[PDB]
Amino acid sequence: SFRDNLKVYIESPESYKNVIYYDDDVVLVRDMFPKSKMHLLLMTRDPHLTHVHPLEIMMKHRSLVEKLVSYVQGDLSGLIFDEARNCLSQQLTNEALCNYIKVGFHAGPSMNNLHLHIMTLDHVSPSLKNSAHYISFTSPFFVKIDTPTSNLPTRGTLTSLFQEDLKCWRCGETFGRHFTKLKAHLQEEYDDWLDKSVS
Amino acid sequence: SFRDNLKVYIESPESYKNVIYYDDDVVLVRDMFPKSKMHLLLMTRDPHLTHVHPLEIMMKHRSLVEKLVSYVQGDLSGLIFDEARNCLSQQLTNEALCNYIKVGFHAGPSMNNLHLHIMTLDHVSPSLKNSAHYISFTSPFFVKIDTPTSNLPTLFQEDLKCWRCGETFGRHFTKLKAHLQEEYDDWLDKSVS
Ligand SMILES: Nc1nc2c(ncn2[C@@H]2O[C@H](COP(=O)(O)O)[C@@H](O)[C@H]2O)c(=O)[nH]1
Ligand SMILES: Nc1nc2c(ncn2[C@@H]2O[C@H](CO)[C@@H](O)[C@H]2O)c(=O)[nH]1
Ligand SMILES: [Zn+2]
Ligand SMILES: [Zn+2]
Numbered sequence: 054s055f056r057d058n059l060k061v062y063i064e065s066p067e068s069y070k071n072v073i074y075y076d077d078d079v080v081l082v083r084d085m086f087p088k089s090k091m092h093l094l095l096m097t098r099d100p101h102l103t104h105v106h107p108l109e110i111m112m113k114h115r116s117l118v119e120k121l122v123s124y125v126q127g128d129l130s131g132l133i134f135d136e137a138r139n140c141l142s143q144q145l146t147n148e149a150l151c152n153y154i155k156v157g158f159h160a161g162p163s164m165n166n167l168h169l170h171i172m173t174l175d176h177v178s179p180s181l182k183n184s185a186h187y188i189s190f191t192s193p194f195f196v197k198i199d200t201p202t203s204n205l206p207t208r209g210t211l212t213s214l215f216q217e218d219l220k221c222w223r224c225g226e227t228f229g230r231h232f233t234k235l236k237a238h239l240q241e242e243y244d245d246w247l248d249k250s251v252s
Numbered sequence: 253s254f255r256d257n258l259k260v261y262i263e264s265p266e267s268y269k270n271v272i273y274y275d276d277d278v279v280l281v282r283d284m285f286p287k288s289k290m291h292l293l294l295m296t297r298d299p300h301l302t303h304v305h306p307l308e309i310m311m312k313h314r315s316l317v318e319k320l321v322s323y324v325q326g327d328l329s330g331l332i333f334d335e336a337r338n339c340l341s342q343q344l345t346n347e348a349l350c351n352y353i354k355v356g357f358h359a360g361p362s363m364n365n366l367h368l369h370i371m372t373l374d375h376v377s378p379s380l381k382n383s384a385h386y387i388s389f390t391s392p393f394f395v396k397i398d399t400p401t402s403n404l405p406t407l408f409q410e411d412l413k414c415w416r417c418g419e420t421f422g423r424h425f426t427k428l429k430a431h432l433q434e435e436y437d438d439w440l441d442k443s444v445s
Contacts, residue, residue: 123442130347148329151350203418225402249322 059166063098074132079124081132086180087172088190090243091140091154093133094168095121103166107158108208110167111196121169122198125156133171141173144251153246157197159189161209169198174222175243177236184232188214191222258365262297273331277319280328282335285379286371287389289436290339290353292332293367294320302365306357309366311401320368321397324355336372343444352439356396358388359405368397373415374436383425384408390415 061068062082066075074081077098084092097103102110102117110117125133134147137154156171176187189195193206194214218227219235223242228235260267261281265274270282276297283291296302301309301316309316324332333346336353352373361367375386387408388394395404412421412428416435421428 119442126348126443147347148350149325151347152325201414201416201418203413203420220402221400223400225400227402249318250325 056163056165059094059096059164059168060103062094063096063103063166073136074129078120081124081129081171083136084170084172087178088181088186089173089175089178091137092170092172092178093136095124095129095171096166096168097121105167106208107162107167107196108160108205111158111200111205112202118198122156125169125171125198137173141175142247142251146252149250149252153250155190155195155197157195157200159209159211160194160196160206161211163211170195175246176222176239177243181236184216184219184230184235185211185214187219187232187235188216191220192216255362255364258293258295258363258367259302261293262295262302262365272335273328278323280323280331280370283369283371286377287380287385288371288374289376290336291369291371291377292335294323294328294370295365295367296320304366306361306366306395307359307404307406310357310395310399310404314401317397321355324368324370324397332370340372340374341440341444345445348443348445352443354389354394354396356394356399359393359395362388369394374439375415375432376436380429383412383423383428386412386425386428 062072062080066072066080069082071083071085072080073083080096080098082094082096084094097117102114105114134150137150138145153174154171155174156169158169162168176190181187189211192214194209196206218229219232220227221235221238221242226238228238261271261279265271265279268281270284271279272282273280279295279297281293281295283293296316301313304313332353333349336349337344353370354373355368355370357368375389380386391407393407412423412425414428414431414435419431421431
């Protein structure tokens, strides 16, 4: 099934050119359908954890949460910032980018193998093709990795994401059901952020 | 009244040892009663903006909002990280600190001259002495500077909640205090180089 598509990256990371880091424990892979300018997935290779729902990981497997966060903040940090510079602009410092990257799980992932999203905020991407994808990263369905355990949402359903009034994550302007207009506005917001942020 | 006391920093910043930056437009000053390990205030010197309510600034003075943000992320960012290192640990990188600093206005300001808080998340401080102090920085009363304008208002009653893990302590302020210290030690241990 398509839900098992990510398994190949944790079975044979050495074989896939969009895997930009691996070791015995984790794989860092570029999303092939990126939903922001930079969109990476950090995957555990542990066969006993990969099929655990991310909300069960956040509640009951804090050892893994801490290990994943230690990779994002530690050994992989320079790699992630360099990928953002490649995806956005080389003139962005780590300091500019830190505030423009989010890290989290979906409350209802479409793929079966556990994957932590590491992505820029912009949501400017040709692969962002419908508003359910947008909502899945800009609502509580996106469970940030530092969410207090008391605050975790319910297990979700990607296909039930729907908003009658689509909303810009940065300024709050709304667009009804007109996703095309929202995308054009996200491009303007990105242009503005970039102008204000480059060195 | 004493509520006008921050005015001295924007009138005569050269005169006060807790001012760590000034220019014609802004002053960056240490909070005298810090509510986290690092707690700074960034103040406009503009006499026509200093007395404007912070929610009116957020709604109607986006020019000033963008200017404050540009100072905080731009020209003052190294001073801010250096201050954080002086207050927390010299072993902390800018990258570790950037996720541990919040920037915002109180929705109901306690002083009359406009002041943007720039502070670490810990709330470990001898000057944090009651529940109102804590809740005013960890609840929607603290209006982050990146809040969308669609989300702005025109509470302190509820149970104390750790901002980091969400554990609650009822109205037991002293238990919250000890817990914040444990949370800070834990963050620090994982964050130092
Ligand atoms: N540097 C300085 N800070 C002050 C003085 N008086 C009060 N403060 C700080 O000013 C802040 C005002 O925050 P507010 O609640 O008004 O948004 C408080 O955190 C308080 O500790 C003072 O004379 N000098
Ligand atoms: N790299 C990669 N990403 C995928 C594949 N199938 C789905 N995705 C992405 O994986 C994520 C799962 O939520 C989404 O962001 C998808 O765009 C695939 O075969 N390879
Ligand atoms: Zn917008
Ligand atoms: Zn806690």
